[PDB]
Design a protein around this ligand. Sequence first.
Ligand SMILES: C=C(C)[C@]12C[C@@H](C)[C@@]34O[C@](Cc5ccccc5)(O[C@@H]1[C@@H]3C=C(COC(=O)Cc1ccc(O)c(OC)c1)C[C@]1(O)C(=O)C(C)=C[C@@H]41)O2
Ligand SMILES: C=C(C)[C@]12C[C@@H](C)[C@@]34O[C@](Cc5ccccc5)(O[C@@H]1[C@@H]3C=C(COC(=O)Cc1ccc(O)c(OC)c1)C[C@]1(O)C(=O)C(C)=C[C@@H]41)O2
Lengths: 80, 67, 528, 80, 79
Amino acid sequence: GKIGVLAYILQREIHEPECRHLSRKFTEWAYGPVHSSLYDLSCIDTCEKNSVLEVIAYSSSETPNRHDMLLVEPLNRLLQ
Amino acid sequence: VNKIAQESKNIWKLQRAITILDTEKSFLKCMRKAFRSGKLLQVGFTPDGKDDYRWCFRVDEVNWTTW
Amino acid sequence: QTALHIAIERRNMTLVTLLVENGADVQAAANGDFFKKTKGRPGFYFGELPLSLAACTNQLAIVKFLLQNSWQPADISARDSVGNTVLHALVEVADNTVDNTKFVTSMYNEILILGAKLHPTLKLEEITNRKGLTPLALAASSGKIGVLAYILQREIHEPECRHLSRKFTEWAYGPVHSSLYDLSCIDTCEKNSVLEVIAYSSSETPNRHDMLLVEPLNRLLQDKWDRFVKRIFYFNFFVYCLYMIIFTAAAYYRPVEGLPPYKLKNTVGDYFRVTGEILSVSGGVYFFFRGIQYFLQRRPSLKSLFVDSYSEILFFVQSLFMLVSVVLYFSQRKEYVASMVFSLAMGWTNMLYYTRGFQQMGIYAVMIEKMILRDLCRFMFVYLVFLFGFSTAVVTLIEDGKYNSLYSTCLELFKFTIGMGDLEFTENYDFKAVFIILLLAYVILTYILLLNMLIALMGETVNKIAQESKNIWKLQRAITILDTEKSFLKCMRKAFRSGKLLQVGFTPDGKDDYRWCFRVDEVNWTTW
Amino acid sequence: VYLVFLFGFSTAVVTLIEDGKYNSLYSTCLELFKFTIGMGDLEFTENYDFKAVFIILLLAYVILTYILLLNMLIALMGET
Amino acid sequence: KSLFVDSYSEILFFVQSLFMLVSVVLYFSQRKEYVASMVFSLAMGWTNMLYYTRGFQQMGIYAVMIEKMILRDLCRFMF
Ligand SMILES: C=C(C)[C@]12C[C@@H](C)[C@@]34O[C@](Cc5ccccc5)(O[C@@H]1[C@@H]3C=C(COC(=O)Cc1ccc(O)c(OC)c1)C[C@]1(O)C(=O)C(C)=C[C@@H]41)O2
Ligand SMILES: C=C(C)[C@]12C[C@@H](C)[C@@]34O[C@](Cc5ccccc5)(O[C@@H]1[C@@H]3C=C(COC(=O)Cc1ccc(O)c(OC)c1)C[C@]1(O)C(=O)C(C)=C[C@@H]41)O2
């Protein structure tokens, strides 16, 4: 339920040489207030065992931000 | 109810997510289309000379703040 | 999209200068789907033109350069694919926040000043888009309360731009001062008066409740009310009360012989009865055609039909029940009674329509409308699920009794809700323990849990909609005013108030401007 | 507001009733008022034709007054 | 402990099915008490319809409140 760390990781963008591959969010274009990103979605949608969606959905209900963690941009858009 | 209205507001989304995962796990038809977003080349330049395909998902967003 | 759009949106003054110098087209329209409203897809609408692009982005220097450069001046009056000019675009980009309103109104004013200085004969604010909306009408329809509030009381203190003002200060003592508001296209105009645009809003408009608090509109509506409309409204209410009394009396003394229509007897009471029936049917026809007129004029979209125009639906349905009753009456079917009573019931409850427009009692009817549409419907779905589930269980358990049917057992379980549940209404079963356990579970789940949950949820909704109802009062008063003025039944011109006064008499040219100003004295005890 | 609802539905019901014991504004108004105090009979007469109309009117009156209006009164009184 | 504060709807659907199967067993065991089981399943079968109201922003709140109230507040009040 570490919503802050999760929101950081899922939206991480690193603007420097030799570390762009570490990013998970990539900005293609941005005109006004509107901009189009690409999110990695490795281990969010599907993976071997612990997809993020599967981990959140099957949380034990003691997890603090289980309700709010799905508001993080890539997950909310992916689920919709 | 005055204290749990806020929680229920998002429990909506949570239950929708649970429904989605169960539907994808059952699926009853050997369907692969449930895996969305397409296999795109993101950078093409790892630390070595290989190119990376990472199944990226496009999200356009509009924010009227932080000008 | 062209290089000029990129330079402007990148905020590159130098590149914009170079591109204009090199023959860039300042009228090039970026008319891709990305640059349109297109609510189902991402995008950014800005009016499609470099000038509107600069204006919407709060780049005043580029606006001035594009308007008055040496190489290619921009057409201040040019219109995009929607017909929108720069000012329409500026109205579009507003979002009613403090800084957004600040810069948008500043840019709007600066564009008006520049338009006057470059084209004194040009009236930007009269230009309409493809929907027929001026920037004022667009701001009114879209609920941009900040822009509307700016425009309606705009006062410009400089030579050769006083004619652009809409508010003029005649004299000022201390906290008190007397102004004149322009009232062009507020009170009346060709199509889109501001009052008509606000009143007939689609109920998704954000500030439709609050926009009528803006000083000139609030004062104008109160003046219209007191001078003209209050008496007509009370007369209409009185006539409706008489109509419902006549309808009630005529229905109450209906004859009880079979097979209508009933032969008229040569006696006084029957002449009064048939007279009342004729008046009742007449009122039904009147409301039927009034409802059709409403629907044709407004054309609600089958979702606005109930969340708005609710009272018009109820009046129309009343008239439909009346007319169906008439048809059955002359078709020699007693079932006309079945129709008539429904109309009669509706006819009385529609009296609550007239309580809206009173700041204390109208809130009650507004709450009834909102509750019935949303919260009662959701509650009744859940309740009916419980009721039907347990009724089916109990009637399955009962074997060959008096009840032994979905109707009887559903009614008997419903009686628990109204505090009349028998709890031993039958013994025609085996397993008394099962029967009583089912009944106790149903009682606890509905009577104790669900009803108190309903009380709590209704408390929350009432706490949340009292604030909105406080202004919905004034909104309904405005709607009443506009309908009364449109009907008017007497060819009266006095409804057009405020008198034809001279503001300046000195436009950019030698003509004089009479603009139907409205005097408003205001008192402010703050900002000393 | 309550008396508007009560009178409207009382007039409807007494119009529907034909030549009964009740068949009068006073008796039917009193009988419908009994629903407010948790004593509504709900089958207080059969002297009509169209039982469906009668029961639909009574159920609509009950839902509008007993369930909606009284709880709305509770909410408004809480606010006051 | 998670069995009721979470997975509540799964418990209710499972209990419905248990009542159904007990009814079948009693039915073929030549006991009329199968009726006693069946009606409970029938009642549960209808109220479990509320499971499908969750996942709708407006309707689902009602069922969520029912779940939480039954588990906590109604139990304390009823004691
Ligand atoms: C949703 C609308 C179309 C509605 C129209 C009719 C059939 C109505 O049943 C309802 C359905 C209903 C029935 C029973 C309980 C709740 C809801 O509610 C209203 C509608 C419900 C009402 C509620 O009372 C009011 O709305 C009065 C009123 C309030 C605010 C207004 O602005 C207003 O303007 C006309 C009228 C009373 C009835 O019209 C009535 O008297 C009878 C016989 C049935 C009621 O349908
Ligand atoms: C605690 C659980 C295991 C529970 C299971 C059964 C026995 C139940 O009795 C209860 C005990 C009870 C009985 C009577 C009043 C309150 C509580 O409540 C629920 C449970 C209580 C319910 C309440 O209705 C609901 O929970 C519907 C529902 C709401 C939210 C959901 O996510 C849901 O998913 C299935 C279902 C209805 C019954 O299942 C029902 O229809 C009968 C015959 C008894 C009710 O036990």
